[PDB]
Amino acid sequence: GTILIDLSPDDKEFQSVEEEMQSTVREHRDGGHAGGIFNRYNILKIQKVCNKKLWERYTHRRKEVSEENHNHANERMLFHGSPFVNAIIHKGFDERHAYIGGMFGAGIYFAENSSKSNQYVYGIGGGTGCPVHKDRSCYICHRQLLFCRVTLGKSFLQFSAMAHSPPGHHSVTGRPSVNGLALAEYVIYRGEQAYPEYLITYQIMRPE
Ligand SMILES: CC(C)c1ccc([C@@H]2NC(=O)c3cccnc3N2)cc1
Ligand SMILES: [Zn+2]
């Protein structure tokens, strides 16, 4: 049921999404081990992901959450990188897309920082890198990220140095307490609380 619609680079929708992508690159404590060494991306394509059934599933859940949290779904747009991006855009998020050993338990992880999601495009810790060159810092192979609509509801705040939501909460907010320049990461425990709205195809760029 999924169809992908190409946005034109001249479209302001493309531009606002590219700007979120580029502006949220940061340095990582691994020096680029997992995701590569870059300060910016070459964006190749931005597609809108259209799936009626996955959208209605998302909105039905969003309304329930909102009703449990003073009419506030606490909806964000957040990045997600995963080797399962093609399954996600066709079938939706589910338990198979959870990070079982994640620091906030077994849920689905999202990032404010695009470069943080980029670390997971080829697997946990970057896996073995790009399929073609086995290079976690490949400047040639095309990567994909999702920019997702995510319902957080009442989010448990965990300051930081498929399972269930903590009782009374709809998600977890991992807030970096040590690196004051890292943005938050978020965990949801039901796939119905995220819709994979934009599929972004890109390359990381070698610093000049
Ligand atoms: C299911 C496995 C392979 C998996 C997929 C995706 C991630 C995940 N992707 C993110 O974009 C992300 C963002 C912030 C923190 N952790 C993340 N991991 C973790 C584990
Ligand atoms: Zn490659």
User: What is the dihedral sign for C-alpha 46, 190, 131, 138?
Assistant: positive
In angstroms, rounded to a whole number, what is the distance separating the alpha carbons of residues 182 and 20?
15
Residues linked to residue 99 through DSSP beta bridges, in sequence order: 107
Q: Which two tokens stand for residue 7?
A: 């946005």
Pairing between β-strand 41-50 and β-strand 155-160 as defined by DSSP bridges:
unpaired
Among 203, 200, 205, smallest CA distance to 80 is for: 200
φ, ψ dihedrals at 201, nearest 5°:
-110, 130
| Ligand 1 pocket mutation pick from 28, 78, 82 by most atoms within 8 angstroms of CB | 82
In angstroms, rounded to a whole number, what is the distance separating the alpha carbons of residues 189 and 98?
8
Q: How far is the CA of 98 from the centre of ligand 2 (A)?
A: 26
In angstroms, rounded to a whole number, what is the distance separating the alpha carbons of residues 115 and 118?
5
Q: Which residue's entry shows tokens 């269930």?
A: 164
In terms of Cβ atoms closer than 10 Å to its own Cβ (0-12, 13-18, 19+), residue 154 is: middle
Q: In sequence order, what are the residues at sequence separation of 6 or more whose Cβ sits closer than 8 angstroms to the Cβ of residue 110?
A: 76, 78, 79, 80, 117, 148, 150, 185, 186, 187, 188, 194
φ, ψ dihedrals at 193, nearest 5°:
-95, 15
Tell me if 146 sits within 8 A of 196, measured CB to CB: yes
Q: Which two tokens stand for residue 3?
A: 């169809």
Among 66, 53, 93, 41, smallest CA distance to 170 is for: 66
In angstroms, rounded to a whole number, what is the distance separating the alpha carbons of residues 122 and 155?
28
In terms of Cβ atoms closer than 10 Å to its own Cβ (0-12, 13-18, 19+), residue 40 is: middle
Among 199, 26, 208, smallest CA distance to 115 is for: 26
Q: How far is the CA of 10 from the centre of ligand 1 (A)?
A: 31
Instruction: Show the domains of the chain with their CATH numbers.
Output: 1-208 (3.90.228.10)
In angstroms, rounded to a whole number, what is the distance separating the alpha carbons of residues 170 and 33?
32
Query: Strand ranges (DSSP E) for 60-189?
Result: 75-80, 108-111, 143-151, 155-160, 171-176, 185-188
φ, ψ dihedrals at 99, nearest 5°:
-95, 95
- Nearest ligand to the CA of 24 is 1
Q: How far is the CA of 44 from the centre of ligand 2 (A)?
A: 15
Annotated binding site: 130, 133, 138, 141
Would the CB of 114 count as within 6 Å of ligand 1?
Answer: no
